[PDB]
Structures are given as C-alpha cells and as structure tokens.
Nucleic acid binder design. Sequence first.
DNA 1: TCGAGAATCCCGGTGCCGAGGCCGCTCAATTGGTCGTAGACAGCTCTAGCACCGCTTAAACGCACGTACGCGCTGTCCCCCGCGTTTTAACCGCCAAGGGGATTACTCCCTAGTCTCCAGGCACGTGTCAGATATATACATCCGAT
DNA 2: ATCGGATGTATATATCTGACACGTGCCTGGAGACTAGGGAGTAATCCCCTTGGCGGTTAAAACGCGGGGGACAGCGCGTACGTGCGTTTAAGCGGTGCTAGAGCTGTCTACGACCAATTGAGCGGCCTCGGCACCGGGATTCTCGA
Lengths: 107, 107, 95, 98, 512, 93, 93, 86, 88
Amino acid sequence: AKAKTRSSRAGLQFPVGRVHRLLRKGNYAERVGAGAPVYLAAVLEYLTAEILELAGNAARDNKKTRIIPRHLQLAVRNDEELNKLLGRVTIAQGGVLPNIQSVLLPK
Amino acid sequence: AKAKTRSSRAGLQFPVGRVHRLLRKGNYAERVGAGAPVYLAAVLEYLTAEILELAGNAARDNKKTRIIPRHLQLAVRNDEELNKLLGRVTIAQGGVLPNIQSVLLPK
Amino acid sequence: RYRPGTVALREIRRYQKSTELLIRKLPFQRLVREIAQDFKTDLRFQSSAVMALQEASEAYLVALFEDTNLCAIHAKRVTIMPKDIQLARRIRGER
Amino acid sequence: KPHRYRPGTVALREIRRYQKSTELLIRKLPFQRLVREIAQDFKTDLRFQSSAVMALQEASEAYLVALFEDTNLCAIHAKRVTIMPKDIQLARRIRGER
Amino acid sequence: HDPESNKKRYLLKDFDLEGTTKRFEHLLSLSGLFKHFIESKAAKDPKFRQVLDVLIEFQFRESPAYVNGQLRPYQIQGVNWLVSLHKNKIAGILADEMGLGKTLQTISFLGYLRYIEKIPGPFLVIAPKSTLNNWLREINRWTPDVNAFILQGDKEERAELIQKKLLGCDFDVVIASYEIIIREKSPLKKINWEYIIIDEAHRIKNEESMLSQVLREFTSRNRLLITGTPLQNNLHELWALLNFLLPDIFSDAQDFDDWFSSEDQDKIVKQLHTVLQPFLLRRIKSDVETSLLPKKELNLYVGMSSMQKKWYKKILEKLLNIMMQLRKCCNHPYLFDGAEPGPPYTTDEHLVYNAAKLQVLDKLLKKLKEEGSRVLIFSQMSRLLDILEDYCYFRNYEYCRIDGSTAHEDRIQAIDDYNAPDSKKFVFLLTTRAGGLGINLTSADVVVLYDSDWNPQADLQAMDRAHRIGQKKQVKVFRLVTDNSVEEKILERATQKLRLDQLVIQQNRTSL
Amino acid sequence: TRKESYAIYVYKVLKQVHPDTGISSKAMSIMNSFVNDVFERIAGEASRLAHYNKRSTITSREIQTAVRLLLPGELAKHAVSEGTKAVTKYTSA
Amino acid sequence: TRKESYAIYVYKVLKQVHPDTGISSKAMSIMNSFVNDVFERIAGEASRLAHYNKRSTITSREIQTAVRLLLPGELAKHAVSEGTKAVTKYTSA
Amino acid sequence: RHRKVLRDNIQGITKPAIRRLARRGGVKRISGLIYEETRGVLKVFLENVIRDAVTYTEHAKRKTVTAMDVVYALKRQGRTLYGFGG
Amino acid sequence: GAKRHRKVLRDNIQGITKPAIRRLARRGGVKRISGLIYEETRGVLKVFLENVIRDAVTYTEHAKRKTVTAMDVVYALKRQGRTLYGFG
DNA sequence: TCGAGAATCCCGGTGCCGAGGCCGCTCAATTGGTCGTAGACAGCTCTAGCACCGCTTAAACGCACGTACGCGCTGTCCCCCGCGTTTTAACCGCCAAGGGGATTACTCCCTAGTCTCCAGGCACGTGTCAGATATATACATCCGAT
DNA sequence: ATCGGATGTATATATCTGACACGTGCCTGGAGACTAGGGAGTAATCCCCTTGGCGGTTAAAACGCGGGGGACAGCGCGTACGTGCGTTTAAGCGGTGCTAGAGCTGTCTACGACCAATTGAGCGGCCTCGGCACCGGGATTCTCGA
Ligand SMILES: [Cl-]
C-alpha cells in the first residue's frame, strides 16, 4: 500500500520511528510496546515547545531575532518549574541572572 | 563429570553463578563475558571483607560480639574512603559520629 | 542548680551516643498518613514503610541542624535562628 | 582636583557589567597550560582536544561563579560585605564537597 | 598639486578585455608553448576560451633628470625593464641579491611613472616593519618633491592619519607594514591603487596566508613584487608568486606542478627558463662584486660522544613526542634533563668532551682566537645557544648575543658595540632566522653554523650577515654535522633544495 | 559517517511557536543535548520501573509514570495530557 | 514466593575475617543492601561504558574500568588487584 | 479510609522532639522561632517523598504503600536508605 | 652562568591571575574581596580540575585511545553530577 | 545642597559569515505475514493492616526566675579600592617536517548463546542456648556554690 | 581555694530471645555439543597534532600611593533563652477481632519479535544574503563635591 509515517498518524512533529529504535536498542527492556514511542515523542515535543517559546519571548525582549545560548539560559532560569527540572545543568556560553544583593547598594 | 562450581574454581566465597545470572537478566548488555562475573564477585567480596573487618574491630572496642548497625556506621564514618563511597547513603538505626564544636565547650 | 549550658552539653553527649528514634511514633504516623491523603484517598501503609519514612526524615533533620550550627557559629553566635536554617538550605541547593 | 568615585561605585558598575555579558573570564592559554600540567600527573604521553579544554573551562568557570555566589551569601550572613577564606571554607563544607 | 583631482582619482565610484588580450598577444609573440597555461585555463574557464581565437623603444638611456644622484650603470636597465613591464600590461618580480640597490631603483621607476606619465599617485608600498623608516628616507631624499607617511602608531593614530591624508587624499605613496595592511584593510580596500609594491616577497608563499588573501581583495591595476630569494622550498612558491603577479595567466597549480615535475629533466628545464624569462630578474653580487671574496665553506663531519650515543640510541628505541629530539641528541645532550648529573652545577670542562660538536668547536675557536678573528655562531635553538653561552663563560670570552627575544634597543646597542671600533668581543651568539636583514655584522669573519636548517635560504641569509658589503678579507663557513645521524638527512634535503633553486633560477641570472 | 540529531524536529517546532525566529547553531546543539538528556532520564526511569514489577515490556503506562515522577507539577500534567492525546489519536488512526 | 539473598556469603566471609563475632539480622540486612547497591552501581557504569564504546558485551576490562571509576583511590587499587588475581586464578583452572 | 480525616497534625512534631534532634545535631542553644521553620521543612520533605512513593504504589496497581516503594522514592530523590530491603 | 635552567615559572596555578578571580567574583556579585581569597580560589579550582580530569582520563584510557575528547569530559562531568549542555 | 562630568544608551553605516534553503542518494522506517509467549483476567486464600480498648507512666505543658548573650553604639586602625604609569604576555600570523592516531573496509575464528539433563547448593523450617537486656548497689567524678 | 550533690560508670545477677546448627526439597547452576556473529586483526588514509623558534599589537596585569570606610574590639543593657518543678496528657503496650487485598495459580489470546521488500525521510554537500557585531558621535543619566 502507501506509506504513512507514525509521526503523521500521531500528529506529532518528532520521529516516532527513531524514538522506537533508540528505545529498543538502548538496553532498556526486552520488549517495547507500540504506544511507548508515541507517548515519549509527544512528551519530548511538549517540553521543546515550552522552552523554545520562552526563549523566543526573551530574544524579542532583547530586540534580536535569533535564539542564542544567552536566551536559553535566561529563559530557563526565569521559570520556576523549568529551572527546577534543570538545576544540575550548566548551559555552555550561557551566563548568570542579573542579580545584586540589596545590602550592597549605596545608601 | 564432577560438579566444580566456578565460585570455588576462582577461589572466591561469593557466588559467581548468581552474579552471572543477574548480569544476564538485569538488562545491562546483550552479551556478557566469561570472566566478568568472576571479576565482579571478587570486587564484592573484597569490599564486604574490608567493611566487615572494621565493623568487627569496632564491635570489639565496644566489648560486644555480634556486630550491629551502630558498629557498621562507626566503621564507615571513622574510615574516610568508605565514608566517601557512601557519602549520600543513610544507614537505618545507625547513629551520629560523636562531635562537638569547640566554641560550645566551657572555658 | 546547674548553669545554662551544662545540661545542654550533657544532653548533646547523651544523644550522640544513642541510636533510637527521637520523634514519637504515633504522631509521625498520623502526620504521614494524613499528608498522603492529598495524593490518593484510602491508602494503607506497611509498618516498615512508616518506619522507613521516620528514619529517613530524622536523618535528614539531624544533618540539617548539623549545618545550621556551623552557620550560627560562623556568624559569631551560639544560638541557631531561622535565618541560619534558611541559609543552610539555600546553600545546600534546596531553595 | 581630578574627581574620584567613592569606594564602592566602580565595584557595583563591574558587577552589573560582568553579570550581563557571557564571555569567558579566565584567559585561554593559562588555563590550557594548567590543564596539561594537572593531567600529566595521571597519564604521561597524553593529548587533549581544543573542544575538550573548552568544555572543561566552561564547567570550571561555572563552578567558581556558583561558589562565589554562596561565598557572598555567607559573608552577608556574617554581617559583612567582604568575603574572606572562612567564607569559601564554610560554603564548601556545607555544600558537602568537603 | 591638485588634491581634489587626486580625490576623484582615488575613491572607487563603482573582465578587462582589452589589456588582457594585449597581454596574450604579447606573450604569444614568443613561443606558443607559453600559451599552454592560457589554453588550459580557457578549456576550464569558458569566459576566456572565446578570447584566444579572436585571431615604444623607450630605452631611457640616461639617469632620470627629475631625480638627483647620478645612477650606477647596472640598474638603468632595471629601470627600463620595469618601464617595459608597465607598458606591457603585465606584472613582474625583481629578485636581486639584497644589496644591489632596490629601494632606489623602484623609487626611480615611481618618479618616472609620475613625471612622464603624469600620475601623482596613488601607490602602495608594503614592507616589513624594520625597513619602514628607510623607505621614507630615500623617497624624501632622491625625489624630495613627493608626499608620504609611515602610517603607524596607536589605533586612534592610524585612524586620524587615514582620515587626514589617505581618505583626505593628500599622498602619492603610502608605506605600511604587513600587520598594518591586515589591520587597516578597510580604508585601503577602496583607493583604486595604481601599483601595489611588496618588498621581501617571501611573506607571500603560502597562498592561504591571510596576508595573501587580503592582497587578492585589493583593487589595483598592476602589481610589483620586490624580493631577495624566490623558491625557498618548492615550485609551488613560484606558483603562488605568479598567481599574485598575473592571476589570469596563472590559475592552475596542477598544470605547473605536473608539467614541470622536477633527459626528462633536461626536457623540462629547456621549457622552464623560457616560461619565466619576461617576469623576474636576478643580478649577481659579482657584477660589481668588487669585494666580498667568495665565501669559503667547509664541513666538519664530527662523530658522537658516549653519552651522546647512549642518548641517541635511547631515543631511537622507546614524554618525548617527535623526531626533533634526534637532532637535539646530536646537538648537545644537556638540552635534555637527564644529563649533567647532580645537581651540583659546575661550569667546568665536563662540557666539551661530553658532547661531540663542542670538542671541534673548541678546537676551532682556539685556532682562531690565537690569530685574531671573531665568531658569529648561528645555531637554530635559542635554548641550545645558552649552553654555548655557559661554555664561552668557562673559557671567559666576550659575548654579544641577539636571540629571538631581545628587544630592539638591546639589539641596536649590541650590534653597535660589537661593530664599534675595535673592542673585546670574541664571540657573537645569534639564532639563525632572527633580526631581519638590516643587521650589518661586517666586523666579524667567522660564521660557524652549529646547526643546519631544512631550507638553505635561511643559512644563506645567515652568511649574508657577514658576507654583505663591508667585510673585505674573507668569510669562513664551518657547518657541523654528526655522521650517522638524521642531520645527514636534513643536510641532503637542504642541498638538493639548493640544487633545485640553482636549476630553476640560478641559470636565469647567468643570462641576467 | 551518518550522524543523527534532533535538529530538524526542533526547528519544525520552533517554526510554529514563533513562526519568524531563527536559532543559531549553539542554541540548537544545546537543545539537542537537552532532548537527549530528557529522553535518557525518562527511559531509564521507565526501565527501572518495569523491572521493579517483574514486567518485561515498556508500555505507555511506564512512560506516563516516568514523566509523572520526573517532571515538576504543572509542567508534568501538561506533558501527561499531551502524551495521552497523541496516543489516542494514533491508536484511533 | 522464593526470595534470595547474600546472607550466606556475607556470613562465610565474616567467619574468616573475624572468626569469633556474629552478626545481627538488621546488620545482615544492611550488608545485603550494601552489596546489592554496589553491584547495581558497578553494573550500571559498565553498561554505560559499553554503550559509549559501541561494544555489545560487558567484559572484565569494563568491570575493571568501572571499579577504577567508582571507588576512591586506595580502595580502587586494592579491589583491582584482587579482581585480577581471581580472574587469572579462575582462567588457569 | 473513613478515618475522620484530620488537619493540624504537624504540631505533633513537638518542641522537645525538635530540641532532641538539635542536640543530636550538636546544637547547644536554640532560639524560639526555629520550631516553625523545622515543621515547615519537615512538611516539605515528607510531601516530596510521599508523593513519589504513592506514584510507585499506584503504578503497580496496588493500594498499600510498601517499604520498597518508600526506599525507591528516597533513592530517586538521592537519599539511599540501607536496612529495609534492597 | 649556571642559567641553562632559566626559570621556576610560578609554575601554573598562579596563572589564574587575581584580576581573573576578581572578574569571577564580580560575576558572582561580590563588592569587596579579602586579600587571601586569591589563594583559596586557586586551591579549590585545582581540586575540582583534578577530580574531573581523573575520570576523563580513565574514560579515554578504557576506550584504548591516546587523546582526550570533549565527549569524555562531558561524560566525566555527568558522572560527577554536573551535566553540561552544548558539547554533544 | 546644583552644576560639572564621565559613563551609558542609542542612533545610524558597514561587512561578513553563518543560517537556511535546495538537491541527490541511501538506508532505516513501513508494509504484510508468521508465530510464540508475556500479560490479562478470575479465582482462591490467608496474611497483614486497620480498628478499637483498657492500663501505666514517661514525656509534654505551663509557669517562675535569673543570667549571659545578642545586638546596638563608639572608636580606631588598616587594608582594600580607585587611579595612574609601566611592563608583559596572550594572541595572531608564520616556518618546517613528520608521523601517529583515528578512522573505514574486510576476513575469520572462537566465545557467547542456545539447547538438553540432572544432581548438589541453597533456601525454608525446625529446634536450641548464650549474648543481650534489665535491675540493683556501690565507687568515681565533675560542678558548682562556697 | 575546698565539701556536697548529682550524674556517670562498673560489677553481679536473672530472664529472654534471636543468632545459629541442623536437616529437608527442589530448583538452578553445571556439564556437554553446535553454532554464528561479534570483535580482533590488517591495512589504507588522511588530517590534526607535535617541537622549536620568529615578529608585532595591544590590551591586561603588575605595582605604588592616599586615603576612606569597614572590620574588629570593647562596652552596656535588657530581653530571651535555659533550668526546675508540678500537673495533664497521650504514647506505648498488650490483646481481640475482622476483612481487604497481596500474592499464586491456570488458560489463553492479543500483541510484540523477526523477516523480506520497498520506498521516502533525512543527512551530507553546497551556495548565498540578511543579522548582528562594531564603530563614531550625540544625547542622556547618575555621581559627586560645592
Ligand atoms: Cl637597499
């Protein structure tokens, strides 16, 4: 018949076939279901969309048109849960949040 | 047709057959070498002996025969290497190493 | 009549030499199994499960106070104040 | 007289400058040379990649910045503004690294 | 004269078929084999293949009147060659022997260009930083009625200078150093250059060198290359030189390399000299020799020492990550850490016998000190030069050392005092490729060459530090090498490179 | 040397949340690393979780429990809903 | 049913390193948990090494590297020594 | 269950209990507002651990929380516990 | 001359200059700095680098190579629990 | 406490190089079928968990009394910051030549997995007795006023 | 500076209970063939690394000086802690009772593994032109010494 990819069938943008292959060959279990790659691809896609939306917001507040590691850093650190998820992670060539302790300010 | 266990053939006391079975059925890799169980059994036996000797010495210091979680705790903490290995491990019904800050003591 | 500090040091030496649990048992069991009703109603708890929770939490709290004390001493005091715990948790990475 | 900023206003300017850019603060060659010298303690006849050293510098600079933040928190707790080696020691001790 | 006419002459307000065709016909005037490159390029580039099938005896006898300083006979014809090159819509190389007089010759040519073709600028002269000030001096001297500036200083200094003069259009020639060109490439990229002149063209051998790339992006009609010695290593260096000279004619390295490929060799050479004849001239120091007696060369095929041999074998078999150690081994074992046991550190005689070359060097310096000569050791390791320093201290002779890292004030005072009227400086240590070409060590007459280089040209320049004009008795090369060592390989490769240079260029000046 | 990477899928997602916005290359590599990190964490949790119950397959139940365990609160419930939605659509199609 | 343990082996080692002491049940539970913990940690590191190096099998060299990478210093060298000792003894039998 | 669901059970972690934990931690003199902070941090810690344990026990299609479930939750949060199976 | 040794080189940890520690401390957000911090910082940095490089070397040694890779450093950092994004 | 006054924010002009389309090809998703085996579900059973209840006594609570300790204040040195020379070393561009270190194709053998039987190692369940609690009394020792 | 109390710390003696030896069933680990495919070995091959040295620009880093404000100490004082002592409370414990729901056992069927064919998705190679970095200069804003 006519080929019809599992990503199209699911309505996703992430590769369900590649997720399935990685999941099988990654030494995670003896057998993998059929709904596992679909579920996992959907979850990864949601997380990517969240972080990219925040980063784009930041890049437009900066008045530039491209996401750079600075905007990735600045968007992750400014969201409570997105930053909780990535506590032990350091973004390369990122930065730090502008922050000065109040006690250090002039009288 | 004499049934000579690999555990005795290697000179260890820990089981090598059981270690091999756990390695095969534990989802670590497709294939498992022949000497891998022997090596891992040797390491486990070594670590067990090393911790158990210090525990026994502590138990003798407290003038008792049977060793207990307190003695295991004392061995791990008084030793430095085992304490670094078990840095984030809590031992149930153990205790705390006696230590009082100097400033708190009377003059 | 002993002077302020003496009985506190005696208690310190006593409790660093023992191994038992310092919180009562029924109160902690009640606290656990009424926290747990925020996630699923009508649960049952293995006695070993409640004991594991108690041991883990007491270990956590003792190790917390053990750093609150350094924070207090470093500030040239011997009294632990809520700011010390807040600082300890902040540095430790929780907050 | 040539005017002079009071002590404490160039330091804030530098804080709010460096805490807004993203470049590497340690130089490149000194750090790479240090990495060579430390590594040849474990295995002689070894070579590195430029990307390897770059990653290692990223990690180390991040580690030191995050250490200095908690150092500052300890110093403020001590009712000061100057950070002293006592602060480094306390921060590393509390955080479980020693 | 007119600054605004120059201003509209300089700035660039926006397939040079006519001049290009004139140059192909000029070339095909000689044997058609010289159109091999053009026809290959045409077969690969469609835009010029249609071009091919489209088919003033200004001898300037006398020295230029506009310039003072009556000219020595041999370079009027150089002037003429340059003029003909210009009125032939082609570029060329001048490759004299570093001292026959090149700055004056080019300045005479520029004066002729301005005062007979009525073109007051613009011209660019790019030089190594050492010789910048010189250029200003001779241009102010010979044809004083001209303007220029050194174009150097701090950032704002060059910025103000260009906005005042360069884009201010108040110049005829501007002279700048290589690094300046690579830095101020923006404003100089739009001046519509008449000529681009490069002195000591060695800098452009690797085409991928950033300076070369920046040189291709400049806008000019005709280019002039001034150099001492082309083809240090391979033919590909002349390939790049000719690329820069005539990019249209020379655009395929592979043709050059394959069609030359080192009797088949005699068949190649009989082509080789013909191809390049109308592009570059080479004089001879013996033309108006009048001096420097030829160099007397010698080799002292030294052996090896016991420690030297054990170290050599120790490295042959297996912290150390190159064959270069093997040359280090034959040089002096103390370069490694693991000899000169101790440490108590003595300056005593435990040096000379310990290494091989040291013994013979000691003998030679004895025989020369006891008769009144001075020595110019030219090793190729600064670190090794320090061992010679210590040894010289032991015998208590008099230093004067120019390493790679001696600041220029020290450089000039040292060369002055060593070259001052007779003084007590027996030895003059120095590292081969250091100092540039302005050094005038004409006092000494011994150029012992402790270590050898991968190319002979560096050595020849090293001997040129004492074989230049001046010193008028003789010069004594004393190259040393340890037999049964990799330095035999280095020496043979260098010698065969020198033979190749002989074959390629050193038959041209026989005609020239 | 074919080398796979989640670059085009990240770019497809980007071109629909902010339809006019680029992403240089280092941001893209960071996002590729982030995707790989999260995939490894969820798959490892699911492996452990299936192993604890003596199961041998990995099912959408294991994946759902893994995401519920690893993600914080409001960021977890959205991901759960998205995944269930995708599975239902795929199984109906 | 049918639950396994390491208690027999821990007891066998104890009554050759200290052939007079006993051990309480809680202590035996602790030592069993410790052995399973260390086994899991080493096995996980070895599998990850295999995955990194595209090898498809766990072998004695990977166990050795995992040991050198988990244990601190002196323990690392002692354990490696005894592992190699046991392996050579076994293969020469 | 029908256990008359209760509130304000955190005050069962009483002042002497917090004081004893402090003494074991090595703390001589204690200020008077430290008990509320201790109750807050204990509540947070318990909420995290119990949430993970309930997640495990509900995935297994069970209704009773087991020592294994609690041990797994602690190991997940980085507080590996020895003594209760493993 | 006794000078064919030529330096002690302040060997390498004093290549982390006090302006560099000052820059890192500013980025951390500190106003005044004590004079002895520039030696504690060097000590702690040396410790951290040793711990990372040991594991990176062990990885690249197990892979039977002789060159250390950004991937090896990333694996070592993740092994210590300091995941670094941006290097594959 | 207001007019320097320097630092920063913000406009345009470059320019240049990296993102982002576009195309070919190749190899891993997809389709269709075979088939064996986890897991799904029901039923059973029997264990452990929840629910009270009464009784003891040890821990909690509340209230008092009085120090000593935390915090605010005042000086006072001293050491760190701001700034102006001055030297230095990172950082590009280069030469010269290797070679060795990683990385694909290709072959092949030997070591794992996969089987079939089958007997001892190990776990479960039992019956002990001795190492631990758990009172008691007496001696030693800090600690606190004298 | 010493007595007097209060709190250990020994040392004896009695009672338990839970380590520990012993036997019993069985299931898994071992033995023995066969085999296939993973990985070791060989050899292209090529591209980045090594060692030693040269030249120049240009910011940074080093260094010295004044001097300002902050750290540290000392003093005071007035609460808020610690320590005791009655009084009330509720945890701990032993005991009974019931039942929900872990945990096993059997059958079977849907669903994942595996394979051969087939075909587009995706990757690498490649070309180009806007985004953003940078550079004056102009205006604006916060510091600061009257
Ligand atoms: Cl000249």
